[PDB]
Amino acid sequence: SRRSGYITIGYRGSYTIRRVARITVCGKTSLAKEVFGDTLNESRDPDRPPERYTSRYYLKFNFLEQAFDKLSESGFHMVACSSTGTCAFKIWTSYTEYVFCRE
Amino acid sequence: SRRSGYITIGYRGSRRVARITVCGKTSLAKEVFGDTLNESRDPPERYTSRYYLKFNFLEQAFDKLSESGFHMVACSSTGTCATSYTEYVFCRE
Amino acid sequence: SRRSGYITIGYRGSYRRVARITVCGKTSLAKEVFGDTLNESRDPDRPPERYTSRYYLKFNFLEQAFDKLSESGFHMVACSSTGTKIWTSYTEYVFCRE
Amino acid sequence: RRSGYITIGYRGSYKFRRVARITVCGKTSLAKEVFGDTLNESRDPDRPPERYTSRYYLKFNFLEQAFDKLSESGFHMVACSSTGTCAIWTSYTEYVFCRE
Amino acid sequence: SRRSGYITIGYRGSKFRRVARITVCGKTSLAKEVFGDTLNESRDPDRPPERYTSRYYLKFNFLEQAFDKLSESGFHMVACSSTGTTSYTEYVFCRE
Incomplete structure (x- = not known):
């Protein structure tokens, strides 16, 4: 409860009438670092203080369930x-976000 | 975590978080968000759907709700293609 | 519990603008929860054990409807x-009292 | 009582809800336990109890009546x-129920 | 728990419901433990248990049969x- 809070995992996908390019991480930077450690890629948003928030971290692996399993190991659900x-001329793309919480 | 009710968090995107809206009992929303809450509408009603938040990190709003006992x-x-509107419902028992 | 059941709350939006909050479920549960704020005009004088999909509420704040459900023990x-310059939507929130 | 999933399907059309067919998917013995004689098997008849179906439907049209029957049998x-599906406008919604 | 984790079940969709293929994503050891011989690992074969996949799929067609097997192994x-626009739906399962 002292280190409670939210982490949101984002994923941009595409379907043609699963493939992963980038798993994004949003939340307080200290929490994302605790959960993901050195798998966190902070290049799009470097050198933030721990009590600041980010919406631009992303992960060095490409399996969605791999991110979920790490969140579970840190007690996030x-x-x-x-x-x-979205429809396009055929290919159709979508952005999915998965909200995790630790009590 | 004293008095029960619902607070709904919304934002419209194209993530770029333009504005985070707060809907619910005005007394509940002020309990949770304090001065991070700009009301921006002139007497106040019991319920609002037009409050919004000064900051732009959605999880920062979620974290403040957690601190007050909302889940x-x-x-x-x-x-629809041409943006989107996303809404997150919180509840304190 | 003996008075258990589901109530679904709906509203049509456009792009928050709430025109009308609809209420679906067994009529006696809807009446227990919302009392005099319930508008039964589109399905009046129904027996307490029958189901409706045509009640609505006399207020337009969604969270006020949620709060009343919570007060009666619905979750x-x-x-x-x-x-679907303006696009409409229908959102429904399913509540259950066990 | 044996665990399982039942999915409830609803073809909607668009303030009120469009009265339509309520479909039931899952292991047939579970669907029959839950709904009894309100279950219509005419599109998938004479199935053995342990086989699965996605073509049952209910003889009433109120979705919450189906939710209530599931609750009575301990499904959540x-x-x-x-x-x-944009074209009025029709949508299809499914509600997944589980008894553990 | 030691063998906790996530499995995501997907189906590409278009009496109404018609489901052709049920995709399975997650750690391969978990998918195998849950689904055993009903699992099709041909698209991504020769994989160690601690590795992840997004290319398994199931030999049967009833979504609720896949859900019921997940329940049997303690996944929720x-x-x-x-x-x-056809549709793609996914169901995220988790065992604590």
């Missing part, structure tokens, strides 16, 4: 999930 |  | 939304 | 999702 | 999302 679709 | 119980989003 | 167990 | 809603 | 459904 999935509490929500949403997805939004 | 996320649902979320939904809708989009 | 939100699911949520879904369907989308 | 664990997920839901809908698909928007 | 924690989230669900769908997107479409």
Whole structure:
């Protein structure tokens, strides 16, 4: 409870009438670092103080469930999930986010 | 974590978090967010759907709800191509 | 519990603008929860054990409906939304009292 | 009582909800336990108890009546999702139930 | 628990429901423990248990049969999302 809070995992996918390019991490930087350690890629947002938030971290691996398993090992649980679709000329893409919480 | 009710967190995206809206009992929202809350509407009603937050990190809003004993119980989003609107429902028992 | 059951709350939006909050479920549960804030005009004088999909509420704050459900011991167990210069949407929030 | 999942499907059309068919998917013995004679097996008849179906439906049209019967048999809603089909406007929503 | 983790079940969709292929994503040891011989590892074969995959799929067609097997191994459904224009729906399962 002293280090409670939220981490959101994001994933951009595409379907043609799973393939991963980048798993994004949003939340307080100290929490994301505790959970993911050196798998965290902070290049898009470097050198932030621990009590600041980020929406631009991402992970050095490409399996979604691999991110979820690490969150579970740190006592975070999935509490929500949403997805939004898009149509294009055929390919259709979507961004999915998975909200995790530690009590 | 004293008096029960719902607070809904919303934002419209294209992540770029333009503005985080707060809906619910006005007294509950002020308990949770204090001066991070700009009301921006002129007397106040018991319920609002037009409060919004000064900061732009969604998880920072979620974390403050957690500190007051609110839990996320649902979320939904809708989009049409030309953006999207996402909503997160919190509840304190 | 003997008075257990589901109530679904819905509303049509456009892009928050809430025109009307709909209420679906067994009528006696809806009446227990919302009392005089319930508008039964589109399905009046129903027996307490029959189901309706046509009640709505006389207020337009969604969280006020959620708060009343909580006061009667109902909890939100699911949520879904369907989308389409203005696009409309329907969102429903499923509540359950066990 | 044996564990399992039952999914409830609802073809909707769009303030009120469009009265339509409520479909039931899962192991047939579970669906029959839950719904009894409100279950319509005419599109998948004479199935053995341990086989699965995705073609049962209910003889009433109120979704919450189906949710209530699931609750009476100890099933709980664990997920839901809908698909928007723009063309009025029709959507399909499914509600996943689980008895552990 | 020692063998805790996530398995995500997917189906590409378009009496109504028609499901062709049920995809399985997660750690390969977990997918194998849950699904055994019903699992199709041909698309991603010769994989060590501690590695992850997004290319397994199931030999049967009933989504609830996949859900029931997950339950039998102590996995629970924690989230669900769908997107479409045809549709793709995924069900996230977790064993603590």
